[PDB]
Amino acid sequence: SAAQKFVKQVIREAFLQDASDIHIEPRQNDVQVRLRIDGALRPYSTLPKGALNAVISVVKIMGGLNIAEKRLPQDGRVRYREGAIDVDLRLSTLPTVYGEKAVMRLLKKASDIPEIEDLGFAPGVFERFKEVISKPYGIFLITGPTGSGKSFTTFSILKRIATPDKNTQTIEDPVEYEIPGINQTQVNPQAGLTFARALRAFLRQDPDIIMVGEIRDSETAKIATEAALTGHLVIATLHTNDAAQAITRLDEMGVEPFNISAALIGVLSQRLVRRVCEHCKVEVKPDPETLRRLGLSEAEIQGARLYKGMGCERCGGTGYKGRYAIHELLVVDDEIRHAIVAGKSATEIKEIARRKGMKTLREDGLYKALQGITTLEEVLARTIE
Amino acid sequence: SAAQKFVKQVIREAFLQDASDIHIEPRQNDVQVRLRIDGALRPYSTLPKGALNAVISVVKIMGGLNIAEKRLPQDGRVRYREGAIDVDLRLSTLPTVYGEKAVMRLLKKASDIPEIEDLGFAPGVFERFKEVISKPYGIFLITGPTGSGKSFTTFSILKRIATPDKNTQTIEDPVEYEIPGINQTQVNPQAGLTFARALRAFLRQDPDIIMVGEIRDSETAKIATEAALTGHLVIATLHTNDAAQAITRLDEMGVEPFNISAALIGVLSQRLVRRVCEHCKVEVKPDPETLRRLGLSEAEIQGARLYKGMGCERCGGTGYKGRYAIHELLVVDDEIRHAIVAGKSATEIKEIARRKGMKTLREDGLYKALQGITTLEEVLARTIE
């Protein structure tokens, strides 16, 4: 609790300062602590060398990390409420030559779950998206790397489709949000209430819409798929970078390809790019050759404006305030499941979908960058694979 | 006794309203109770939040569930008798963030099962339906999501064709109705009595008619087809959005296409639409332009009498009371047989079937909406065409 009270004092003073990050760094003879204020790291405090393991355990408990594991990096998430400071923290631990270093990123205050029309879909992709989630049943997968806005998009969907004539039931680890009109159930491993234990009880609970917060079992993948097969609408998340790899991911978790093919409505992969500041924004002229290589049509290449923030402190550092989302939406059709039943590659499906008109993250990112929402760099950074 | 009084009333009201399920839902500041009627959830009442644990208690006593346990789902069965009420109830309790939700399902009986004349078949389809079930051997598939009326149709058929000169054998998970005249067997995991293990045994039981409640696995799909092949009549349920996809799905499940083309009598795809309440029923002047994009001809727009129910006390305000089935009946002939082998797609099969006389779900829906059985939107909400 010497350790616990230090950790809680740091997060507090980080919150009140509007600090973005907190670094706990072992050194040769001490542990330095630093806070990023207005873009720069500042010295907060100094802990003795022996104090290291104590503190690292406290933040590991907070994010559900493994204490025993010290040779490998771990990431986690901390929903932190103590009194008047509620901040969500992104947690990172890293093996360092002097012991384990921890970094906690203070996330922007979430605000409220938006309507479907304010998620930042391209006008064209939006219509196909609205058609995927309006379907009576089947499973709709939302994927992306840690913190790409999966849960946020998921609840925006539920906000739309969970009508009083339906039973919307939810399994989450943990439950975020107090969204009305639906029933929410949190995973309890203490009790024995796993994802699969719950998901099987849900089938005896007369559901219409099932939201599976996370699929990380074979049991869960199988049950969610059969729920989609028998006539329920399932929304679930995976942690996969490619929309097509989500299909392959399910094959690996033990789902029969013919069941994947019969239930899957589509897969949404998204990213978050920083938004350029509207105030210190400037026009930039792109190398036509770059645009060309990015698959942008010649005949579109003359309008040709890209944008970037030089910076003020409405931005702080950066030229960026806020984040926006990037999407590629794999809508399953007669030909795609016609590729899943056959031996597939994620690769083959992707271009089988691109033809038929599927717009890719980079294409989606590029086009929003052409609007001055984001830089081309942020777009490239998120789509490099 | 106040919680006893509530449970008594809500089951009484569900019974008289023909309600599938009672939902008792803990929410943030109250308890909400919903009735599913005609497949649609409907608000029944609100309880004050501190009355939850008394009500759940009554429900648990009925089904012999543990009161102490509130962290894990529970399941029960009760034969409920109050006044003249005699219903079997299936009880489900499930922990949510605001406490345990309860679902009580009102179960049907054999007496509720219709005669095939009352299944709602259009006159042209009904004559073909009859010729399909009156064949000596082959496999007949009934497909669609849960709550489509698959079991009602199945046993309706067995009421007409399980005459006393034949052995009529059933494998079910679970056995729902107790039917006179036929032999029924329930799937039992704990003993190892699979669908496939049961079905293997049926072939040494001198059967005539075989009913497979559900085809989930690849082995069951093969043995049921084999049993059809050798000279037995097989009625089985599958989940597909479409009659033609039942062919493709058997393929995907591993059945040899030459075996499918050899054994398959036909497929029935089925949905349930809501009937227009006839205490609200008000005639509505059709819009021709909207009836033209919907593939209806000029002749059909004449002789078109649409209706919509202007909500009343008897329909709970919905404008609907009762349900009705819409049908897509694929009847296998030689051309469909040659297309099943030669591995044509479901879309190819479907277009063959229609040219040969098959009405799609949408078309059967539209046809009955023009009779004022149901409304247009119900047809559009229950069919992706």
Ligand SMILES: Nc1ncnc2c1ncn2[C@@H]1O[C@H](COP(=O)(O)OP(=O)(O)OP(O)(O)=S)[C@@H](O)[C@H]1O
């Ligand atoms: N479309 C969006 N635009 C801007 N910010 C967003 C958007 N979606 C999410 N965010 C924010 O970004 C953070 C991402 O949180 P989530 O939406 O929960 O991400 P996630 O993919 O669920 O991440 P996990 O669950 O930790 S792997 C939250 O702080 C959201 O406020």
Ligand SMILES: Nc1ncnc2c1ncn2[C@@H]1O[C@H](COP(=O)(O)OP(=O)(O)OP(O)(O)=S)[C@@H](O)[C@H]1O
């Ligand atoms: N032809 C019909 N017309 C009107 N209501 C019907 C009809 N068939 C079924 N129903 C109602 O719909 C409910 C569900 O029908 P079921 O046949 O039991 O459902 P199913 O999901 O299609 O088949 P299962 O999963 O093996 S019970 C029945 O219990 C009846 O209340």
Ligand SMILES: [Mg+2]
């Ligand atoms: Mg999440």
Ligand SMILES: [Zn+2]
């Ligand atoms: Zn700026």
Ligand SMILES: [Zn+2]
């Ligand atoms: Zn009415």
